[PDB]
Amino acid sequence: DRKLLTLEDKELGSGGTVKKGYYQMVVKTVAVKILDPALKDELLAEANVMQQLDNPYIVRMIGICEAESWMLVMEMAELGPLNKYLQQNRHVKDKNIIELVHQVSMGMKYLEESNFVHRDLAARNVLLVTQHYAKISDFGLSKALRADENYYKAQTHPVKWYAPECINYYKFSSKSDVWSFGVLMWEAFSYGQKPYRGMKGSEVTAMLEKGERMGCPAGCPREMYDLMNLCWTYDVENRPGFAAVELRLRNYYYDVVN
Ligand SMILES: Cc1nn(-c2ccnc(Nc3ccc4c(c3)c(Cl)nn4C)n2)cc1CN1CC(O)C1
């Protein structure tokens, strides 16, 4: 009910617009994504997925608002995109970055179990509730998998976060979200640095099929860099699943705690 939502004149970010608002339920603070007949359907589908998901480390949507424009309203994470933050806060300890990406992998594991493929997992589409609390956002590309198939198949087509099988065969699985998570891990320990800096997506694809990968980010626990590389296994069937990844993040996290 639109009149029970208030918005800022200014925009958190852009590319339409994203805006902070307050939704009278005690008011709760909220984020709204502000938006051709196709785009409604997308925002509306984007919203259908979120509704079905229930997890600490996934952004909770409130609902959709039909008003002046088409608008999407979610439980708001004040601290914003993980990448931008990390860039502007170099003082954050690797122990905390582990904490955060274990949270994303816990969030992704739930998503796997719910047989949904994200398709846009990246450091920009992780948001911080707090500096110790991460949530995955941006389900605009997400698909619920069929009950009898482990992958979504697309038509003609973000390249630098996508596994080879996505680039060559258009197949998006939980395992391809693992590839992206790998790039998201790289981004995290490179304090918000962009991946494969300066290259064209085509060169990136040529590089990967040569067997080459990105180097270790300064300060990065070797065990985490090893995980990045298990995540970047070329063969979809040898690349670990999100259960296997989460397990390794958890086990490793505790040994660093004390
Ligand atoms: C679908 C969606 N949800 N959502 C959101 C949800 C909860 N809190 C917040 N807080 C928040 C969200 C976005 C922000 C900032 C803070 C800042 Cl600062 N800049 N930007 C773009 N934002 C943000 C988006 C669109 N963005 C493109 C990607 O970076 C996320």
Side-chain angles (χ1 to χ4, degrees):
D1 171 75
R2 177 64 175 77
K3 63 162 67 60
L4 297 186
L5 178 87
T6 324
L7 298 174
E8 308 322 274
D9 59 334
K10 86 207 300 287
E11 304 167 16
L12 285 151
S14 64
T17 70
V18 184
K19 291 179 181 178
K20 181 180 194 185
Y22 315 84
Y23 193 77
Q24 188 172 353
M25 292 281 267
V26 172
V27 295
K28 185 130 170 57
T29 311
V30 288
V32 20
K33 183 188 184 64
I34 299 95
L35 200 92
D36 177 48
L39 266 288
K40 168 171 94 169
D41 309 313
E42 293 193 334
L43 203 88
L44 294 213
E46 175 172 15
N48 187 29
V49 176
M50 293 189 84
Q51 185 166 207
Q52 302 196 47
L53 309 169
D54 181 41
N55 190 267
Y57 311 107
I58 301 254
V59 162
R60 274 171 174 94
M61 67 174 292
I62 304 304
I64 313 157
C65 196
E66 193 181 24
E68 30 154 310
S69 258
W70 289 97
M71 292 171 176
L72 177 62
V73 175
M74 301 140 291
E75 190 197 30
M76 137 69 89
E78 317 282 358
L79 273 56
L82 175 86
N83 61 328
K84 290 181 185 177
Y85 183 82
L86 286 188
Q87 296 168 337
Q88 304 183 321
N89 299 279
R90 300 299 310 262
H91 70 268
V92 176
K93 296 169 185 278
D94 59 0
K95 293 180 180 177
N96 180 206
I97 299 195
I98 286 151
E99 172 174 51
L100 293 169
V101 309
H102 175 240
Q103 288 166 2
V104 174
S105 80
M106 277 196 290
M108 284 306 299
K109 186 181 140 49
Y110 167 75
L111 210 70
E112 166 155 11
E113 298 152 3
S114 323
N115 282 113
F116 271 97
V117 172
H118 194 287
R119 291 176 72 228
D120 203 12
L121 195 55
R124 55 174 184 286
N125 305 337
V126 174
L127 307 174
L128 293 156
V129 180
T130 66
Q131 70 177 9
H132 301 293
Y133 193 175
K135 286 180 183 261
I136 299 155
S137 63
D138 288 350
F139 296 83
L141 288 172
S142 299
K143 307 291 184 174
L145 298 163
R146 283 159 54 96
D148 65 335
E149 289 280 18
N150 81 279
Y151 64 88
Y152 166 76
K153 187 83 168 74
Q155 270 48 228
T156 53
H157 209 76
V159 170
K160 279 175 197 216
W161 278 264
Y162 278 6
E165 77 270 10
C166 311
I167 301 324
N168 294 313
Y169 298 105
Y170 297 4
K171 309 181 94 154
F172 295 90
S173 78
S174 272
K175 298 292 196 91
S176 48
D177 286 344
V178 173
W179 191 281
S180 303
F181 182 71
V183 183
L184 181 151
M185 276 193 284
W186 189 91
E187 283 180 277
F189 293 102
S190 305
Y191 290 85
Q193 202 48 237
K194 296 177 182 181
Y196 310 95
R197 186 185 60 191
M199 302 169 61
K200 300 172 173 212
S202 48
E203 287 157 336
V204 165
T205 290
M207 179 187 163
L208 296 175
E209 246 177 283
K210 289 187 294 186
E212 295 169 11
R213 305 290 188 275
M214 304 188 273
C216 192
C220 183
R222 197 55 41 171
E223 292 90 353
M224 299 288 89
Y225 180 62
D226 295 354
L227 187 60
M228 290 179 202
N229 271 305
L230 192 61
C231 286
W232 304 323
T233 304
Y234 194 96
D235 174 46
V236 208
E237 209 59 46
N238 296 345
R239 197 185 302 145
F242 262 117
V245 173
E246 193 286 314
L247 195 61
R248 175 57 181 167
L249 264 160
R250 192 201 290 143
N251 280 3
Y252 180 76
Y253 181 49
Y254 301 154
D255 277 16
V256 192
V257 165
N258 302 278

